[PDB]
Design a protein around this nucleic acid. Sequence first.
RNA 1: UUAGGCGGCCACAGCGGUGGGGUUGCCUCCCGUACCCAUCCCGAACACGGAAGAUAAGCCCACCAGCGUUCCGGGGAGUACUGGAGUGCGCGAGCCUCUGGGAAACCCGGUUCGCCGCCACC
RNA 2: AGUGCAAGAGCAAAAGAUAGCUUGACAGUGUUCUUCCCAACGAGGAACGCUGACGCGAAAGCGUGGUCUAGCGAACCAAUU
RNA 3: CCUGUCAAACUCCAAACUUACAGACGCCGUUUGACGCGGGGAUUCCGGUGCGCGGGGUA
Lengths: 140, 186, 160, 95, 154
Amino acid sequence: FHEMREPRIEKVVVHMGIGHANAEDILGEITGQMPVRTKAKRTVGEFDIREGDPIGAKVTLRDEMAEEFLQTALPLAELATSQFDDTGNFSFGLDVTVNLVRPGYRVAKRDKASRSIPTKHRLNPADAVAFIESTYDVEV
Amino acid sequence: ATGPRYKVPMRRRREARTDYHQRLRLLKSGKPRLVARKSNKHVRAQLVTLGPNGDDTLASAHSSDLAEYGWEAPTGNMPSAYLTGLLAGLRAQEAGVEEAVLDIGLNSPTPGSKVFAIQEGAIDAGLDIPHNDDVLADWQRTRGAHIAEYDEQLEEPLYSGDFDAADLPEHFDELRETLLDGDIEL
Amino acid sequence: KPASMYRDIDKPAYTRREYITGIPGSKIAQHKMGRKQKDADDYPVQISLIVEETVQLRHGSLEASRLSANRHLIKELGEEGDYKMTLRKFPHQVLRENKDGMRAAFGKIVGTAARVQAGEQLFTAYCNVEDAEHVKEAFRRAYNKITPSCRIDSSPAGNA
Amino acid sequence: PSSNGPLEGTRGKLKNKPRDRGTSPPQRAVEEFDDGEKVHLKIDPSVPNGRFHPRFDGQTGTVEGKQGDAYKVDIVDGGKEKTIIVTAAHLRRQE
Amino acid sequence: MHALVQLRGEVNMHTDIQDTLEMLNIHHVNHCTLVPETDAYRGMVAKVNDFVAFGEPSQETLETVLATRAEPLEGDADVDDEWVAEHTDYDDISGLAFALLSEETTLREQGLSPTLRLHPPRGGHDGVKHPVKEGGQLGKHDTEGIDDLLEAMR
RNA sequence: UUAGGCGGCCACAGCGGUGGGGUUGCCUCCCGUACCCAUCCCGAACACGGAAGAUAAGCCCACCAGCGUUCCGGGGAGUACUGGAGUGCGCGAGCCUCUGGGAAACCCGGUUCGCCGCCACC
RNA sequence: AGUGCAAGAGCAAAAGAUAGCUUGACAGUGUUCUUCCCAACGAGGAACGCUGACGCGAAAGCGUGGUCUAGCGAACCAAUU
RNA sequence: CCUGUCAAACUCCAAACUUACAGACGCCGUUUGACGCGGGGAUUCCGGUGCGCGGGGUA
Ligand SMILES: [Cl-]
Ligand SMILES: [Cl-]
Ligand SMILES: [Mg+2]
Ligand SMILES: [Mg+2]
Ligand SMILES: [Mg+2]
Ligand SMILES: [Mg+2]
Ligand SMILES: [Mg+2]
Ligand SMILES: [Mg+2]
Ligand SMILES: [Mg+2]
Ligand code: NA
Ligand code: NA
Ligand code: NA
Ligand code: NA
Ligand SMILES: [Sr+2]
Ligand SMILES: [Sr+2]
Ligand SMILES: [Sr+2]
Ligand SMILES: [Sr+2]
Ligand SMILES: [Sr+2]
Ligand SMILES: [Sr+2]
Ligand SMILES: [Sr+2]
């Protein structure tokens, strides 16, 4: 029961919300894989009337790439309980978002007979802090 | 759910099991549907027709009943998918069915996939089905060659239980050979 | 303008403000009088003024009757007396006047009125057995300023 | 009426009851009728094509052949006989 | 079985109501017909309710009216027991009356006109501006009320 | 249907909740990227290959009515409204009687936590 | 929400969005309805066919312009194919 | 939560009633030929009143 209940990292999303790009290059080095362009929506007074146009870049790491990054990434932050989502997620900062979830999360990500994960199988800030804190660092 | 005016989707839609828009287009042919479905371990082919109170399956074949004709191999692969279509196809021919349109449900039209193998299998059984040859994996892969070469990169047998070490696409031939033959007890 | 012009319900309901502009403001000062911080439950006596005929009452009449009614209650129970009275109807019906002969006569907007079916309570007061005859006298003055004849019906009050 | 287009005064008859909103089930859009069959005509708000003139909603005609996938339905408008082209989606068998 | 008598003329009566009377074979004021109590016939009398007098007559009364106003499908031949016996599936007027009231046959089936052309009500009727319950002659009557009327119009 | 596939009706099926279930069986989660195929970046998904583990999700079975929905009883109500008729009443706006139909809100007590068809399957 | 524009209506694994590809906004000829309820009347419009040639898709299929109802013009004469 | 009111261009509801088709009864038609079809001749295209339902208008 506990085996299919113990949390895990689904994805590590590192992104730099600029506002006009050239920054892609560093993310590629700090993470290990190709970054992606970020387009914006709606016209913006702040000389941002152009809808589809580069404004940021992100990277979604999964599995090793995720941990190998967090290893030398988490030590760079001072995690606090507040910095945690209601789903058991947390982000710090260049931004670093960590998406944590239980074993059969795919049930809500597959094409056929997908289903929303029950509030019971959903992760919690509490169960989140633990898992993480239970690995190279401290909470609050 | 929320109130009187709330709109709940059709059941097969909530269950995320039936693409109704694709279904309609499918049914517009007037021909039966070769329903190709797949499980983590198995593959199923059904020849379905329209009915007053629901659909009518006229013939079908599951990868399980493959062993019934001499199959000691796994059932969630290409050779399995093809032969399964062929068996369902053959039985289809038996019940009088002569043509069909491929219904892959919520699966993707990926070139060379198993839903397409099921289709090539059903076609070889003599069923007339609108298709496209260059979307079907090439013969060898259907035989299961891709898995043989994979077992070549051995060091540890690909299959746990022992069906064979370097596997056998030749077994595919035996079974297909057995099906294309008349004697067979459909 | 005479009420004979609008007292009857001889026209479609005309209330949609999304299709009507220039609607004059209501002259009704208040719909809840007396001590509105208190509940009507806290009173032994409840008397209502019931309209005996179905009619339309222009906001100008609601204000005159209500005024002359509450005005009496204030002069008899005090500007803080232990009572409460309610004007439960609101003038939703917009009225017109065609003020050029009968050509393109759709009238211009000139006011508002409340439709009241016979037997309905226009006003309702709640008092103590003491001031029961004072609320009855306020209504006598009120119904003298509205088209129809009215009934002064006593609801909770078995102190006869 | 203020205008005379085909959809004049059709607010009610061409609007779905709230819960019948959304794509309709394919079964009735594929139904097959035989010549001679009595069929009630009623446009399905959710189905754009294959409709007849709204003025005929409520008629109970007679299938007298087909044109492509649509059906040719015979009706009597007042005293005049007319043929209506309509798809199964807007038809229902009588009784 | 109910006896139907038109008491109000055709001028100004709705056409669909006048046609209903004609379908019930009544084409004149004071004309009477016998109608089976069926759902179909029930709607018809209900529609003509305000221009007619109706109800179930007694065996005797029916016999009196048949003897006095019944007529052959064609011809002036008087209708008496002998006529009845020599022309119908019954022995005398009584047998016919019973069969009619029990709804086993109809005046037509027995070669009789479907209509009894009654005489104006002797002593006058109760008026055609109000129903029975209000003291008038219109609408559904008592077996006794219907009998009183039919007899006065024998 | 000791867990499957395709459906019809499209909430009586929704929302929410509780309990129960799987050694070579089923569905899954699950393990894993040489291939077919795949990600404007990610074997996440899609696709392919496969069984070390699991019944915690899903799913299936049993069930709970608090919300939403369906239908039923009793009350509201033969009220509201209404087709036909009237030398009935009212200054009048309007009302009444006879005849034939007949709600809605809401309250209270039940019902409803899907029904059904085809195929396959210890 | 969006879906060019009035209003009312339609639409969620889409009729909306993004990406890519494409030119069916195609030629010929009809059926039917509408215009004009019933009930005769032109231009115009729409739905639905057949034939030809194509686009996309694995395929069923979709595309006779824009989700639907406004955006239109006789004879004579001219120019054009 | 409680408490006071509404809608020609509002509707979770919802009549009476109007209406398509069919069966039944009624009535009608097969020498009075109905229903339908073709052809000749028109007149007519200032209407009015009561009742019901209206919309405009103080009326
Ligand atoms: Cl599948
Ligand atoms: Cl049409
Ligand atoms: Mg309307
Ligand atoms: Mg005679
Ligand atoms: Mg008299
Ligand atoms: Mg459990
Ligand atoms: Mg009078
Ligand atoms: Mg000229
Ligand atoms: Mg030119
Ligand atoms: Na970009
Ligand atoms: Na629909
Ligand atoms: Na489970
Ligand atoms: Na035309
Ligand atoms: Sr008026
Ligand atoms: Sr007065
Ligand atoms: Sr994985
Ligand atoms: Sr007067
Ligand atoms: Sr009843
Ligand atoms: Sr279109
Ligand atoms: Sr009408």
